[PDB]
Design a protein around this ligand. Structure first.
Ligand SMILES: *[C@@H]1O[C@H](CO)[C@@H](O[C@@H]2O[C@H](CO)[C@@H](O)[C@H](O)[C@H]2NC(C)=O)[C@H](O)[C@H]1NC(C)=O
Ligand code: NAG
Ligand code: NAG
Ligand code: NAG
Ligand code: NAG
Ligand code: NAG
Lengths: 294, 99, 73, 362, 50, 50
């Protein structure tokens, strides 16, 4: 059973820039050394993505509280997370998130994944209380406080963990794209080891398709689930949690755009052009080239 | 070199158009339908592809006429500038033609 | 059922293809004899080495002709 | 002269098939013969996956009043492979069965169930006057007669809000100009044929470019390599040569397209080896002949092909058969190409490198 | 099923009209002429064919 | 002379093409069909000949 946490306090939102991120493979067709134009739901270049910390210290007292605010899900979501201690565990998707309508759960423990679709009666504060054992502490034991009850589940999926194990600044970025089209919840994913970059890295990395669940359910909202290191019985003065939440996660929204993807001989999407971004990109898309003569 | 390549590329790309048919692939049409409706789809494909080929050939004829004019000019310049000394102003070069 | 459209298209393309060789022959086949320069290139100080064939090179071409064939993709 | 007469088009052998190894059986009795047939306002929809479909049994039953396939022919359903199937079942009377078709209008068409105008699939319908009828009347089937707007294709939103047809809303109270949206129908064994119940099952085929889960009863023959074959991979038919590929298809990539309109590579489902598809061969065929006023001998040029696919002389223009190559150089008589010309001289057809003229040192 | 371009029991097993069919199909009620009180099983109908 | 003669001969011979119609002869289509279907056939002939 879940435990109620302190008030959200209605944190003021913050924004950052998406430096050519969120490109994924739009099909399951192999292409090499080509420039292919696809119209699909992509994250527009240089968009304003909202970022939330894992733990935020806003009060002068030293309060360490979770930042897991509720966000809507319209036409797909780009979800990045920079972490180095695996404080992120999964997501929930749905519209009402209660005993009325069914909802989707993805969680990744230290062993494998759990993906379910049913009417979880989610409470306001779902997470996983984590601890190590006193002898080995090689892997991390978790007690999930996500939902009170779950009934009428018609799905179940278990596979290799979506998130690797991250156990001084070995922070890594994890990118995901979620689309609900034709009853298909398509998740695309990618991982990048990063050096000395706190914010989103400027660069290119396409998201390989991770899974396509034929759930056939209705999604308009979602949440994010984290791991609690400190104790809700005795909140420590400082450093009990994960360093006052250095790790963070960013959210952006997909839009119907036409992109020009460049496939190399190895079949990897090395670069892309967002046609409707600016006149130079439009020229590149009409000429179907990445370089434009005078 | 570019224009002709462009033309050929365009022609090949016209094979991806359905021209109102259920598919642009002939084998998929023949694998799904019996002759009565398969012929209806194939006629649309044939109309589109025949129009594309005719357009390509017309542009090729016009471009060939332009290239023939250029080649006739080149032959005239070979005769009058290389095999002789021309008094025609600016026909060979700028200035008084020597060779 | 469309008759001779394909044959017409093939005939036009064949005509164009033949006309290309006709163009080349009209431009370049304007000499009966294959003339050659003397082995000693003493022309009173005039030097034609950059337009004369380079014999110490396969597919005998002048340096200018070699550059021209290298600059067209 | 030389005349383009034909185009040689090397032919296929031993047509191969490579359907998946799936050996399940489709649920055509627990969905097609369910004891409960839902109403049209909430039609029973089942997703069909991973099973082997034999549409011959269903189509060959003679128990159906209606069997209409759109985008596909019923007889050819056995050879095809689909990424997924949808089965939507309901019950309607005869006069409205005509509205289960792409591009049809009416009460049920725009208010209860709407097939898309781009429909690919088969609608099956039969009379159930002996099952759904009641002597006193079976009012358990509900249709929608009024709505704020028509349906988009494949729309199912269950609502009981009474709609206001007058100048003032009644706010959920059944009163004047506020009718109840759900209309029931009085099924009777004595009902007219236009009003007797018919059970309808609509099969929608997902003809996507995805790994086919539902397939027909076909046998996967052994794979053949470096040969011109008629292939059928996952219902995708074609004709060409399959060869070793070093392409790296990532575990989600099934097909391969560097031309974007022809599958130049394919992942075999049985063995996940990926093979590239190069067409067998083709090229022009030219007949080099002197005037028939001189002789009847001919030579044949197979343009742009090596002398293995077909007095055999490999020129840059292709393979020459019937002409002897000579070391001498002459003026061009019949242009073959790439500096090669042909002539008829004493009496055989000779092929030679053309001479540009006599050498002359000034 | 006596119309061209159709596939059906009769159209596949008993009478198959060509796609390029030129001619007239005429049909009229004949219960007063062929049907019997005790049952007229004098007209056969093909079900099975390879 | 030969080019113009060949072009005219090809233009003449194109009149024997059905272009998908039931016949390449306009008079036969008019004599066999009523206006609603005759128009359908004549439209195919018109498209091809134009
Ligand atoms: C004609 O001009 C060419 C250059 O265009 C001369 O070739 C040069 O010869 C000198 C040696 O004398 C070399 O060092 C240069 O590298 C050569 N240049 C090139 C571009 O090859 C040639 O010598 C001249 N002929 C005469 C007779 O003077
Ligand atoms: C999805 O849920 C939202 C919010 O509950 C609702 O407004 C919308 O109509 C739903 N759509 C479908 C197709 O169920
Ligand atoms: C399908 O079955 C064949 C025959 O047993 C087998 O060789 C092949 O590996 C199977 N496919 C998969 C994906 O295992
Ligand atoms: C459904 O049931 C009836 C009677 O029980 C049977 O005749 C029919 O064959 C069944 N359907 C199929 C697809 O077998
Ligand atoms: C034809 O094939 C032979 C096989 O050894 C090869 O040596 C030759 O280069 C080929 N010729 C052409 C024109 O491809
Ligand atoms: C040409 O002559 C050489 C010897 O000089 C000989 O090897 C070759 O076979 C000859 N070519 C033909 C086509 O006879």
């Amino acid at each position: 059973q879940c435990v109620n946490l302190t008030t959200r306090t209605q944190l003021p939102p913050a924004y950052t820039n998406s430096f050519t991120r969120g490109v994924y493979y739009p099909d399951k067709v192999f292409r090499s050394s080509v420039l292919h134009s696809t119209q699909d739901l992509f994250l527009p270049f240089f968009s304003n993505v909202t970022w939330f910390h894992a733990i935020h210290v806003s009060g002068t007292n030293g309060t360490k509280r979770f930042d897991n605010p509720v966000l809507p899900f319209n036409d797909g979501v780009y979800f990045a997370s920079t972490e180095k201690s695996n404080i992120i565990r999964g997501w929930i998707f749905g519209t009402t998130l209660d005993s009325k309508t069914q909802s989707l759960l993805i969680v990744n423990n230290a062993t494998n994944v759990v993906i379910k679709v049913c009417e979880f009666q989610f409470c306001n504060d779902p997470f996983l209380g984590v601890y190590y054992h006193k002898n080995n502490k090689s892997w991390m034991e978790s007690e999930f406080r996500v939902y009170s009850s779950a009934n009428n589940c018609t799905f179940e999926y278990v596979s290799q963990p979506f998130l690797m194990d991250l156990e001084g600044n070995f922070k890594n970025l994890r990118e995901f794209v979620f689309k609900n089209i034709d009853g298909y919840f398509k998740i695309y994913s990618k991982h990048t080891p990063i050096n000395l970059v706190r914010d989103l890295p400027q660069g290119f990395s396409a998201l390989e398709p991770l899974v396509d669940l034929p759930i056939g359910i209705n999604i308009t909202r979602f949440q994010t689930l984290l791991a609690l290191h400190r104790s809700y019985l005795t909140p420590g003065d400082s450093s009990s949690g994960w360093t006052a939440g250095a790790a963070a996660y960013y959210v952006g929204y997909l839009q119907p755009r036409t992109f020009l993807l460049k496939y190399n001989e190895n079949g990897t999407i090395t670069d892309a052009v967002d046609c409707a971004l600016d006149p130079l990109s439009e020229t590149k898309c009409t000429l179907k080239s990445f370089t434009v003569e005078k | 070199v570019n224009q002709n390549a462009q033309a050929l590329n365009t022609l090949v790309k016209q094979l991806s158009s359905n021209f109102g048919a259920i598919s642009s692939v002939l084998n998929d049409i023949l694998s799904r339908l019996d002759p009565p409706e398969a012929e209806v789809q194939i006629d649309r494909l044939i109309t589109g592809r025949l129009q594309s080929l005719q357009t390509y050939v017309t542009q090729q004829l016009i471009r060939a006429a332009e290239i023939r004019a250029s080649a006739n000019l080149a032959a005239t310049k070979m005769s009058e500038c290389v095999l002789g000394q021309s008094k025609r102003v600016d026909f060979c070069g700028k200035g008084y033609h020597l060779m | 059922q469309y008759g001779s459209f394909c044959t017409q298209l093939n005939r036009a393309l064949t005509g164009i293809a033949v006309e290309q060789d006709k163009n080349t022959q009209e431009v370049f086949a304007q000499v009966k004899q294959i003339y050659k320069t003397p082995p000693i290139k003493d022309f009173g100080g005039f030097n034609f080495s950059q337009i004369l064939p380079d014999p110490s090179k396969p597919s005998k071409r002048s340096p200018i002709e070699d550059l021209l064939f290298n600059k067209v993709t | 002269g030389i005349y383009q007469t034909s185009n040689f088009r090397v032919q296929p052998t031993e047509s191969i098939v490579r359907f998946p190894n799936i050996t399940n059986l489709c649920p055509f009795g627990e969905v097609f013969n369910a004891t409960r047939f839902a109403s049209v306002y909430a039609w029973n929809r089942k997703r069909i996956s991973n099973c082997v479909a034999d549409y011959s049994v269903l189509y060959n039953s003679a128990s159906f009043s209606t069997f209409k396939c759109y985008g596909v022919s019923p007889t050819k359903l056995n050879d095809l492979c689909f990424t997924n199937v949808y089965a939507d079942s309901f019950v309607i009377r005869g006069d409205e069965v005509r509205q289960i078709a792409p591009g049809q209008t009416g009460k049920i068409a725009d208010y209860n169930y709407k097939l898309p105008d781009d429909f690919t699939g088969c609608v099956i319908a039969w009379n159930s006057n002996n099952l759904d009828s009641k002597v006193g009347g079976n009012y358990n089937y509900l249709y929608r007669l009024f709505r704020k707007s028509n349906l988009k294709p494949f729309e199912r939103d269950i609502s009981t809000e009474i709609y206001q047809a007058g100048s003032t809303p009644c706010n959920g109270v059944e009163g004047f100009n506020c009718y109840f949206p759900l209309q029931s129908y009085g099924f009777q064994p004595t009902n007219g044929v236009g009003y007797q119940p018919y059970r309808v099952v609509v099969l929608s085929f997902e003809l996507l470019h995805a790994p086919a889960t539902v397939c027909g009863p076909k046998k996967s023959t052994n794979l053949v390599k470096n040969k011109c074959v008629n292939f059928n991979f996952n219902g995708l038919t074609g004709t060409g040569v399959l060869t070793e590929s070093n392409k790296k298809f990532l575990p989600f990539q099934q097909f391969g397209r560097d031309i974007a309109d022809t599958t130049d590579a394919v992942r075999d489902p049985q063995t996940l080896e990926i093979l590239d598809i190069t067409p067998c061969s083709f090229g022009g065929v030219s007949v080099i002949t002197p005037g028939t006023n001189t002789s009847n001998q001919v030579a044949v040029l197979y343009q742009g092909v090596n002398c293995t696919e077909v007095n055999v002389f490999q020129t840059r223009a292709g393979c020459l058969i019937g002409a002897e190559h000579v070391n001498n150089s002459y003026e061009c008589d019949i242009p073959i190409g790439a500096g090669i010309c042909a002539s008829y001289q004493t009496q055989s057809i000779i092929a030679y490198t053309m001479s540009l003229g006599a050498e002359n040192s000034v």
